[PDB]
Amino acid sequence: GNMSFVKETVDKLLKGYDIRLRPDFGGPPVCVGMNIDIASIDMVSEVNMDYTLTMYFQQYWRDKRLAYSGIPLNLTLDNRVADQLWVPDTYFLNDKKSFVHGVTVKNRMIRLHPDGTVLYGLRITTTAACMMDLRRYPLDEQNCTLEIESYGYTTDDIEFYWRGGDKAVTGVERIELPQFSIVEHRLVSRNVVFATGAYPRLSLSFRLKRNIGYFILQTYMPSILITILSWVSFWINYDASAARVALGITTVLTMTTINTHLRETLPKIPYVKAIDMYLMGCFVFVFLALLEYAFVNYIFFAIDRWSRIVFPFTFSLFNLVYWLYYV
Amino acid sequence: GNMSFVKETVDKLLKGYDIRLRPDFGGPPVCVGMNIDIASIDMVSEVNMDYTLTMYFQQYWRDKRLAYSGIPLNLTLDNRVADQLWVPDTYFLNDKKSFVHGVTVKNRMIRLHPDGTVLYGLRITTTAACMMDLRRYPLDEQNCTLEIESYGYTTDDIEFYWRGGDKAVTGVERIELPQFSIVEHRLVSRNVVFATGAYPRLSLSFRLKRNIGYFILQTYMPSILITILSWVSFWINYDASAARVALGITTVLTMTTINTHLRETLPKIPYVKAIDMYLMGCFVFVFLALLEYAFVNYIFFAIDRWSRIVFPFTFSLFNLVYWLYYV
Amino acid sequence: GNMSFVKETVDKLLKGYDIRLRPDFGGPPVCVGMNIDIASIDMVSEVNMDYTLTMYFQQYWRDKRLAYSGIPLNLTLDNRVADQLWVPDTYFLNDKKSFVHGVTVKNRMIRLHPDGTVLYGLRITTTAACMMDLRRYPLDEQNCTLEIESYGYTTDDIEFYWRGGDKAVTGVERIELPQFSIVEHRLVSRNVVFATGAYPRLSLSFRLKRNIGYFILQTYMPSILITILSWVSFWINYDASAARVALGITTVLTMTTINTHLRETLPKIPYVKAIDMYLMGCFVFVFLALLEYAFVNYIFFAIDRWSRIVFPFTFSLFNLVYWLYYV
Amino acid sequence: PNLDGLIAGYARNFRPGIGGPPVNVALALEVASIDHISEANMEYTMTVFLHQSWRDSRLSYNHTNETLGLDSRFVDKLWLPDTFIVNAKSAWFHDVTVENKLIRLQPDGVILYSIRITSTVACDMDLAKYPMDEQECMLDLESYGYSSEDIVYYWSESQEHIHGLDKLQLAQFTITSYRFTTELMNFKSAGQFPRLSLHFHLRRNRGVYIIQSYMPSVLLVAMSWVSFWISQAAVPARVSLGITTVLTMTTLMVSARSSLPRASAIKALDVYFWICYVFVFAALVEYAFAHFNADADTIDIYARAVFPAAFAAVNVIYWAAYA
Amino acid sequence: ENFTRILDSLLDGYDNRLRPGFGGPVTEVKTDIYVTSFGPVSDVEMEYTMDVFFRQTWIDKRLKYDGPIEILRLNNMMVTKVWTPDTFFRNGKKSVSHNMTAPNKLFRIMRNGTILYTMRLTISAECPMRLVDFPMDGHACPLKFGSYAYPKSEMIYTWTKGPEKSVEVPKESSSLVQYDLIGQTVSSETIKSITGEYIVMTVYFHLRRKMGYFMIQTYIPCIMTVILSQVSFWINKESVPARTVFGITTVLTMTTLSISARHSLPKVSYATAMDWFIAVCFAFVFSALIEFAAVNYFTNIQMEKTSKIDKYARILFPVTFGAFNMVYWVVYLSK
Amino acid sequence: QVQLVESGGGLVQGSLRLSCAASGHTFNYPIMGWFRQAPGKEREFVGAISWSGGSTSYADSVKDRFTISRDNAKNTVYLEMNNLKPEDTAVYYCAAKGRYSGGLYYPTNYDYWGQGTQVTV
Amino acid sequence: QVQLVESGGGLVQGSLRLSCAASGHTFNYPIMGWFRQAPGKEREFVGAISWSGGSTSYADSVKDRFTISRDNAKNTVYLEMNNLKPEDTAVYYCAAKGRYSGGLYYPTNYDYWGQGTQVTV
Ligand SMILES: *[C@@H]1O[C@H](CO)[C@@H](O[C@@H]2O[C@H](CO)[C@@H](O[C@@H]3O[C@H](CO[C@H]4O[C@H](CO)[C@@H](O)[C@H](O)[C@@H]4O)[C@@H](O)[C@H](O[C@H]4O[C@H](CO)[C@@H](O)[C@H](O)[C@@H]4O)[C@@H]3O)[C@H](O)[C@H]2NC(C)=O)[C@H](O)[C@H]1NC(C)=O
Ligand SMILES: *[C@@H]1O[C@H](CO)[C@@H](O[C@@H]2O[C@H](CO)[C@@H](O[C@@H]3O[C@H](CO[C@H]4O[C@H](CO)[C@@H](O)[C@H](O)[C@@H]4O)[C@@H](O)[C@H](O[C@H]4O[C@H](CO)[C@@H](O)[C@H](O)[C@@H]4O)[C@@H]3O)[C@H](O)[C@H]2NC(C)=O)[C@H](O)[C@H]1NC(C)=O
Ligand SMILES: *[C@@H]1O[C@H](CO)[C@@H](O)[C@H](O)[C@H]1NC(C)=O
Ligand SMILES: *[C@@H]1O[C@H](CO)[C@@H](O)[C@H](O)[C@H]1NC(C)=O
Ligand SMILES: CCCCCCCC
Ligand SMILES: [Cl-]
Ligand SMILES: [Cl-]
Ligand SMILES: [Cl-]
């Protein structure tokens, strides 16, 4: 209540405070507790193999230099005080681009406690790398992580833990990605060794399951409809050369445009995906349908009836094997 | 352990410290050791002729002004101390755009040693120029370098070396580019002379071998399938003018759309690539197939049978010569 | 060698130094010598009518306030000293966006000389405006300049010169633009008058000659091949209405798609380019070929033979006139 | 003079009455413009004049009874509320020619703090009825670090007059209604944080944009009906007409969702394409059924009436559902 | 220290947080704009870019000095030590103050206390557009600037020269591609807000769009497509497959042209002039396809117990389309 | 979750080919390492290979003696121990490293350890 | 890895054409330089040409006397020594410069040196 008294107390705390030295410098490591509140996952990019996360990132640690007596309150201080305090040198090892939000002020909090506990909060948006296995795309499940580490302090000097254990990360229910469901999240703690020493690590990972629905509509269904279209040829008289050859060409070429378009939406991976396998199967069906007519055409100068039954049935077999293997 | 003692020692180190003067100013050059830990190569762009690298960049040098006694520890200091120290004026001569990561703090480390050795670490993402020879694209091998140099200090004042020799660069195994394999990396050291004097240089280069698989599927296979499609015409009766002319047109025009689309994904180079040679060969085959029908059409108002054998065989020869020359 | 002696000398230089006042304030103008070392020209954009240049920009001037005695060395100082010195207020009048590279430090140099000469170097990437005359595109030659001027100091206060005359700019041989060759560069010096007074100007210009090769392959050759394709119609029997009308349509429509696509790669200029003239000629040929069939069709319910000779010959004439006028 | 005296001894790190009752902060918004309303990114860009008013007794002066108009230079000296936009993907200040901030200090200690900020605000959009859909977007304002025990927000009485949402003109949307809401039960992890939210409803304009969206689909269906009047003898003519409508309809569906790459939800436009695809595909099957049985002219006669009637009937059902 | 003492004396007892004549006469700022580059206009974003030399002049008696030199041309960092107007652009979406090799700021002090302060700025400003007459339309892009914090009772803005001569845009500065800068008009108004009543200075740049690009990109392909469709009339009715392909391809081509025309154009509810031209051309192309259907339908009835429809179509279609062009161009080019 | 089974050790006087067959989520663990633990001595780095690319690294002791490579079809890595020496007498272990799990050289960075073939010569 | 063989020197009283034929990785070394070393004197810059573009530069001594150009087909550079003088008496060497290897003028920046034709007049 007495602002001169509080001002005196805080001035005394910061008098001769050396930001260069961690709490308990030269002694046991400072334990830093970390909790995350997820605001959003804005984007997941296959082409860039990354995702964009917004979170409230909070760090908890005790600094005995900041302990104060005679005030039974937690002091919430203006965020600019953070520049006069030691804070951990935490970074995100797999981040590509990150920033602290700055409007209307730096989205930063400092709360001091009488025992010298410092609560330091930041609102961060990060684009973080996530290597994806697209062999089953778009029936794939991905593991995207956020790796949290101390940059310069080893485990001799700093230690990390998930504050609250399995409850340290909140807001996973808020994530609303149209193309993915969050199956699970996990929290891990370990030490990572480099040439410069052993460093504390915290890892947050998510299991993402792709929703098929968009892909059924966008790629699978057009391919099915083109393949069915190709079969119309077999009901046309063999003298209708222009009509039946037109059907063969248009379906074959449409399947090429669909294939090439699709792979321009994705990174230039050297392996075959699940969707590639489907499109290649569909291409073979429609190509053989045209070749069937070439064969009929070839001898006329029963086969059509045989095509009317065998082709749709074979496509059913193809689909059965495919969707069983991958679903 | 005694933080007042450590604070006193460090304050004494920085008292009267002149950041303007290099260590041993006016004396022998300061030797700066450099090690790199590669985190990722995010992107390789043919259109922009550049690549994006993320690395941990560490510099090692001795500054006798920072030597301290009576403390048998290496002092890890808050990264903000870097602003009160001399550091080398290292830059990347072939970089296009670079930044030091800034969340949650500047990804920077300072570790002092009792003898005055300074360890200075930065986490940097750089987009760096890489002129590519696309004459064999996409069967090409590229050499992309990172050129590290002192901006203003000559070899009279500063010297660079790879700290650890051939082990100075780690993490090459981490690089996971879908379109490339890292064949080799090399470390070079030399002096580079300009009008203003001789400057120390360190060069890190990689040999990148393009993976063919994506290109086989995306460009080569469609071209093969269009060329085969063109041959169907030869099994159609010569009276089927609409059917056979349709086949000729559609294949010819599809090969044009494939060509023009492809070169819109690449920079506007004035020379012919390997892929251009293939597409031009395929174009000639399908164009001649249509012209074959024009010739048949021309006289009817044996040639088809001759086309049925000679065309596929010639395409086999074309492919044999091509893939031997380039693979 | 004695760092305390050098520190004393430099401290004395900067004691009472007023950054607000140019050297010889109130006296004759300070002569500033400028040299450029070109690192790269990364990009040339017709759509944005600009180019991107990377260079080492050096400024030479004498500041008698910084003269020092008793040290027979040139002092290379940490780049942060630049903030304590007067420097010229040089800017690039036709630049769109520029920055000084900042990794690992600001790419900046300061070298002092005993007589008070200051060498100030910067590594700059600039996007600079370049209005292009696209009337002959893509057989065009462009003049792109970089205009260097003093922002606030008139020629009463500051003067510019190319240090070394015609050798002041190096590295023109390094420029490797796929689409352009550098024919020539020139260095100019003049005074530019505004309402606020006369200002010193230095101008660096390049003559860029577009390489035709890419355009031959990308636009010219497809147009030639479509035009030849259109002529196939004349060797088809006049009863083959579907075949000959198909040829007419497909070639006409392909020429429209080529035209419209091309102009979407370029700025929305209101005048006709060289390439537009070619495509319009090719369009007229293929359109007349279809109209020729309409005429034949019109009377049948010799002209074809006449078309077989007159059309290719007229296309040869068209090409001859075109390529003579523009090459 | 006394201006330096107010700063002398002023505690910047502490809110007015740190240990006492929470600071009441009056909040006002002047929406300058709304643009870049992207459904693919589910975001909109808004430029506002954010006005914050609160009382600070430390700055009370009695030498004069006139308010002190100060520029952005004095802003850094004083304590300010840590107001931030909750759903802002990115935001920034306008600093040309100087920082667009103002401080007006009254003798009683009332502070007027106005800033000009442009923010890209995330807005979840339901594309079920796209493009005949109305979207509601929000602008949430909240203290980042100070709970309800320290800072309490409330809309100023002037907010009802100077919001400026009526004067806005949007290229594709129309602001049907707006609402200013106060939520005192946010209860973030740190504590209870009162939140002030601006809700405005956007209705997508129905006009040439919607007509252009549905024009190619309808014309392809209409073009397929032309084959009914064509004689069955001309087999290549009717087959070519039938296939072109089907293939172009397939490409239209592919290009429709290529504009919105991540819109995995069902859109009303996608449903209409499926309806159009059925009609154009049935027309080709109708000829194939007639051609196979002609190895009947009545089939075409029925097709000339059933298909136009069925397409009209399904359209009435479709447009009634999406109104 | 002949001039160092003079500058120190001026800054001694000087508060940059108070405007000159604080609490007394209204501070008058004389402003003129030199447009070095009028950048491209983005129709989709309804914004335009511009690079200017923004000059401001005002009298500050606190900086009066007695010295041999009349004008003190100082370094650009002297600006932060003195008071400057807080001019901001009300419709500016995103503006940049250039900082290359130095802050591009000019600062001069005269013995009378007159201050010249010019800064090089790149301005992106809102330009609302009515595209009803597009592409044969003209727009007046505004530029509104004024004090952010000082109301009209404390600071006012005036043009240094006359209103006509204060904003100068040299013909060389035109970086426009599809627009032509006819001229500029200058006016000053007042606006009211909760903070107070402020002087607003407005510059209107009158732009006339050049239709050469749209004539060849859109109008010519549409006209040729209509002419191409009418070629089918002269084809004999017996060639049913041949004339069918004519109708299909022309209709599909018109669909592509309609989409491409609206690609770069921003999405608006109203219909542009080019939209009407495409719609009419689409109607003509579709009618040509319907005409062949009528010919084929009626010739089967005649066959089942050289066409009049074709003969009238060969004349009426070119005449009606030609008549439409005469009406369409005269109406819009007259405006 | 990775399982590693190694075989082809034994006792010889000579060229040898240890093999290491992986199964499971190998995508999350792109690096395979070879370690060896002599009796008494600490567990010691031998070499490592990326599954994708085959980027290889060796300890100095075995540089230009041992050669590692793999085949992604079988999910198998092999240490080709040529030019053997009596120093090369240890339990050779195979292990998998996570993508972000630190330096190649340090066995504590590795999660999934094979059984370990004893090899004496 | 570049190999340079030069020929066409000899002794004359006059126009001469030195030639310089390159082979190998010329892409990494886009610049070819001509140097000349008189007996006793230091090795001296004559001129340089970019393979791509033919951007040329000359020392003052030979400016508007010598002319360099190339043909990329043969991978050949030529110094056309017209208007010769008794100062032009030296072992003329050819050399290749790396892309990032510094200023044109300085022979230590160049990596791959031709044999060197002696020319006396
Ligand atoms: C996405 O992919 C990542 C990997 O890239 C997965 O991360 C792994 O998660 C598992 C848990 O699911 C981690 O396994 C656990 O590791 C803990 C750390 O152990 C290390 O450190 C201790 C010392 O602190 C050492 O003793 C030890 O040797 C390690 O060096 C262990 O403590 C855990 O043990 C617990 O569980 C096991 C059973 O799993 C019990 O047997 C134990 O008794 C104990 O209860 C556990 O082993 C693994 O380390 C993580 N890998 C990495 C590289 O971090 C993500 O899980 C995945 N995402 C999803 C959603 O699956
Ligand atoms: C991508 O492309 C770049 C070039 O653009 C290649 O870089 C070259 O790499 C080679 C090595 O592979 C370098 O060659 C070496 O240069 C060293 C430096 O020599 C200079 O400096 C010394 C003084 O320090 C001078 O005496 C000397 O004249 C040079 O000015 C040499 O020390 C090396 O010599 C060693 O190897 C040779 C055999 O190669 C032995 O004969 C020697 O005895 C000694 O052991 C060597 O010559 C070359 O300089 C690099 N070029 C540039 C421009 O840096 C990359 O290698 C390439 N990437 C890949 C993966 O291939
Ligand atoms: C202070 O804030 C509370 C909570 O918003 C509000 O109810 C009250 O009216 C405010 N007081 C004044 C004087 O506006
Ligand atoms: C002071 O003199 C300058 C000289 O250029 C003039 O422009 C200015 O108007 C004068 N001031 C007054 C108040 O007359
Ligand atoms: C949610 C309304 C769906 C309406 C579908 C109508 C199909 C004819
Ligand atoms: Cl970052
Ligand atoms: Cl940079
Ligand atoms: Cl932000």
GROMACS .gro file of C-alpha atoms in nm, chain B residues 16-27 48-49 57 59 65 82-100 106 120 122 124-125 129 131 149 151-154 157 194 196-197 199 241-242 245 249 252-253 256 259-261 263-264 266-272 276 280 283 287 290-291 293-294 297-298 301, chain C residues 1-4 6-7 10-11 14 37 39 42-43 46 54-58 60 71 73-81 84 99-109 111 119 121-123 125 137 174 176 178-179 211-215 217-218 222 225-226 228-229 232 235-237 239-244 246-247 250-251 254 261 265 308:
model
  166
  343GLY     CA    1   3.896   0.019  -1.816
  344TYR     CA    2   3.840  -0.248  -2.081
  345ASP     CA    3   3.848  -0.088  -2.427
  346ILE     CA    4   3.621  -0.273  -2.669
  347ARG     CA    5   3.776  -0.071  -2.952
  348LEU     CA    6   4.113  -0.250  -2.932
  349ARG     CA    7   4.164  -0.611  -3.034
  350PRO     CA    8   4.360  -0.839  -2.799
  351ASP     CA    9   4.734  -0.780  -2.844
  352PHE     CA   10   4.663  -0.463  -3.044
  353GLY     CA   11   4.982  -0.358  -3.219
  354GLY     CA   12   5.134  -0.702  -3.163
  375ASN     CA   13   1.715  -1.810  -5.623
  376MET     CA   14   2.043  -2.007  -5.646
  384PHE     CA   15   2.880  -2.090  -3.478
  386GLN     CA   16   3.464  -1.866  -3.198
  392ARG     CA   17   4.280  -0.863  -2.063
  409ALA     CA   18   2.911  -0.993  -2.508
  410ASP     CA   19   2.823  -0.625  -2.559
  411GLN     CA   20   3.104  -0.524  -2.320
  412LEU     CA   21   3.374  -0.740  -2.482
  413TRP     CA   22   3.575  -0.727  -2.799
  414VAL     CA   23   3.461  -0.994  -3.044
  415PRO     CA   24   3.592  -1.073  -3.393
  416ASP     CA   25   3.429  -0.897  -3.687
  417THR     CA   26   3.344  -1.223  -3.859
  418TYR     CA   27   3.100  -1.222  -4.149
  419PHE     CA   28   2.981  -1.459  -4.421
  420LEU     CA   29   3.096  -1.318  -4.754
  421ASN     CA   30   2.845  -1.514  -4.966
  422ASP     CA   31   2.545  -1.475  -4.736
  423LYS     CA   32   2.225  -1.314  -4.862
  424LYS     CA   33   2.031  -1.276  -4.536
  425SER     CA   34   2.120  -1.388  -4.184
  426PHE     CA   35   2.002  -1.337  -3.828
  427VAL     CA   36   2.082  -1.447  -3.474
  433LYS     CA   37   1.963  -1.378  -2.805
  447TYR     CA   38   3.173  -1.708  -2.805
  449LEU     CA   39   2.598  -1.793  -3.178
  451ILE     CA   40   2.267  -1.838  -3.682
  452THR     CA   41   2.035  -1.899  -3.974
  456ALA     CA   42   2.445  -1.778  -5.237
  458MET     CA   43   2.577  -2.062  -5.805
  476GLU     CA   44   3.611  -1.399  -4.336
  478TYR     CA   45   3.555  -0.792  -4.232
  479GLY     CA   46   3.801  -0.523  -4.129
  480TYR     CA   47   4.101  -0.688  -3.965
  481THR     CA   48   4.377  -0.804  -4.199
  484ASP     CA   49   4.574  -0.834  -3.693
  521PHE     CA   50   4.195  -0.710  -5.159
  523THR     CA   51   4.280  -0.290  -4.850
  524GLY     CA   52   4.506  -0.586  -4.769
  526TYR     CA   53   4.233  -1.110  -4.504
  568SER     CA   54  -0.914  -3.967  -8.946
  569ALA     CA   55  -1.070  -3.800  -8.642
  572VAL     CA   56  -0.549  -3.688  -8.574
  576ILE     CA   57  -0.268  -3.335  -8.148
  579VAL     CA   58   0.199  -3.304  -7.915
  580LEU     CA   59   0.017  -3.039  -7.711
  583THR     CA   60   0.433  -2.861  -7.491
  586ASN     CA   61   0.788  -2.847  -7.123
  587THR     CA   62   0.666  -2.494  -7.052
  588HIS     CA   63   0.537  -2.580  -6.704
  590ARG     CA   64   1.084  -2.436  -6.703
  591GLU     CA   65   0.856  -2.207  -6.498
  593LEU     CA   66   1.340  -2.303  -6.262
  594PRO     CA   67   1.544  -1.986  -6.321
  595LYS     CA   68   1.553  -1.824  -6.665
  596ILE     CA   69   1.883  -1.979  -6.772
  597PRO     CA   70   1.982  -1.942  -7.141
  598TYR     CA   71   2.127  -2.293  -7.189
  599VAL     CA   72   1.976  -2.637  -7.248
  603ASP     CA   73   1.526  -3.019  -7.180
  607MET     CA   74   1.285  -3.229  -7.693
  610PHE     CA   75   0.848  -3.403  -7.861
  614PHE     CA   76   0.538  -3.495  -8.360
  617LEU     CA   77   0.139  -3.732  -8.620
  618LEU     CA   78   0.335  -3.646  -8.936
  620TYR     CA   79  -0.034  -4.018  -9.024
  621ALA     CA   80  -0.038  -3.705  -9.240
  624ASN     CA   81  -0.344  -3.979  -9.511
  625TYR     CA   82  -0.167  -3.795  -9.795
  628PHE     CA   83  -0.649  -4.052 -10.113
  655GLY     CA   84   5.219  -0.241  -2.911
  656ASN     CA   85   5.161  -0.059  -2.583
  657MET     CA   86   4.783  -0.090  -2.554
  658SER     CA   87   4.761   0.167  -2.273
  660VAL     CA   88   4.706   0.343  -2.792
  661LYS     CA   89   4.404   0.358  -2.560
  664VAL     CA   90   4.229   0.719  -2.901
  665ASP     CA   91   4.055   0.842  -2.585
  668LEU     CA   92   3.732   1.127  -2.893
  691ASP     CA   93   3.342  -0.348  -5.479
  693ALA     CA   94   2.977  -0.868  -5.473
  696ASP     CA   95   2.121  -1.117  -5.721
  697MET     CA   96   1.804  -1.042  -5.918
  700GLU     CA   97   1.089  -0.665  -6.493
  708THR     CA   98   2.528  -0.644  -5.301
  709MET     CA   99   2.844  -0.437  -5.268
  710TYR     CA  100   3.122  -0.328  -5.036
  711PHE     CA  101   3.070   0.048  -5.006
  712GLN     CA  102   3.373   0.243  -4.883
  714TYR     CA  103   3.728   0.805  -4.768
  725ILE     CA  104   5.208   0.580  -3.390
  727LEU     CA  105   5.036   0.240  -3.796
  728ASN     CA  106   4.689   0.255  -3.942
  729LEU     CA  107   4.447   0.179  -3.659
  730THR     CA  108   4.174  -0.070  -3.744
  731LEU     CA  109   3.907  -0.014  -3.479
  732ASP     CA  110   3.606  -0.219  -3.374
  733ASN     CA  111   3.307  -0.126  -3.589
  734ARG     CA  112   3.117   0.009  -3.287
  735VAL     CA  113   3.347   0.314  -3.287
  738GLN     CA  114   3.112   0.794  -3.192
  753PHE     CA  115   2.016  -0.293  -4.522
  754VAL     CA  116   2.362  -0.335  -4.372
  755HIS     CA  117   2.440  -0.701  -4.307
  756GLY     CA  118   2.446  -0.776  -3.936
  757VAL     CA  119   2.597  -1.122  -3.878
  758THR     CA  120   2.797  -1.195  -3.688
  759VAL     CA  121   2.842  -0.822  -3.634
  760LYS     CA  122   2.741  -0.517  -3.834
  761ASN     CA  123   2.936  -0.555  -4.158
  762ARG     CA  124   3.117  -0.227  -4.101
  763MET     CA  125   3.480  -0.118  -4.088
  765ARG     CA  126   4.031   0.239  -4.022
  773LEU     CA  127   3.822   0.476  -4.405
  775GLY     CA  128   3.336   0.052  -4.515
  776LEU     CA  129   2.990  -0.104  -4.528
  777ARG     CA  130   2.854  -0.421  -4.685
  779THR     CA  131   2.241  -0.507  -5.014
  791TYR     CA  132   1.165  -0.710  -7.512
  828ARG     CA  133   3.182  -1.108  -6.080
  830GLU     CA  134   2.670  -1.350  -6.319
  832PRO     CA  135   2.179  -1.578  -6.645
  833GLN     CA  136   1.944  -1.351  -6.841
  865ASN     CA  137   2.035  -1.306  -7.359
  866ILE     CA  138   1.792  -1.429  -7.623
  867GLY     CA  139   1.854  -1.801  -7.570
  868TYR     CA  140   1.595  -1.860  -7.299
  869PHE     CA  141   1.326  -1.678  -7.498
  871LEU     CA  142   1.333  -2.188  -7.631
  872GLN     CA  143   1.045  -2.078  -7.408
  876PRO     CA  144   0.662  -2.325  -7.931
  879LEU     CA  145   0.594  -2.541  -8.378
  880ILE     CA  146   0.226  -2.451  -8.337
  882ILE     CA  147   0.389  -2.556  -8.849
  883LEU     CA  148   0.129  -2.784  -8.687
  886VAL     CA  149  -0.070  -3.014  -9.150
  889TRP     CA  150  -0.244  -3.210  -9.649
  890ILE     CA  151  -0.568  -3.361  -9.513
  891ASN     CA  152  -0.864  -3.440  -9.736
  893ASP     CA  153  -1.397  -3.437  -9.636
  894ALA     CA  154  -1.213  -3.490  -9.303
  895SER     CA  155  -1.409  -3.206  -9.146
  896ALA     CA  156  -1.359  -3.313  -8.784
  897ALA     CA  157  -0.983  -3.360  -8.830
  898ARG     CA  158  -0.916  -3.032  -9.010
  900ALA     CA  159  -0.977  -2.976  -8.481
  901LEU     CA  160  -0.634  -2.871  -8.610
  904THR     CA  161  -0.632  -2.638  -8.119
  905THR     CA  162  -0.360  -2.425  -8.281
  908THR     CA  163  -0.291  -2.278  -7.800
  915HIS     CA  164   0.038  -1.668  -7.003
  919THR     CA  165   0.492  -1.286  -6.625
  962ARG     CA  166   0.080  -2.586  -9.895
   0.00000   0.00000   0.00000
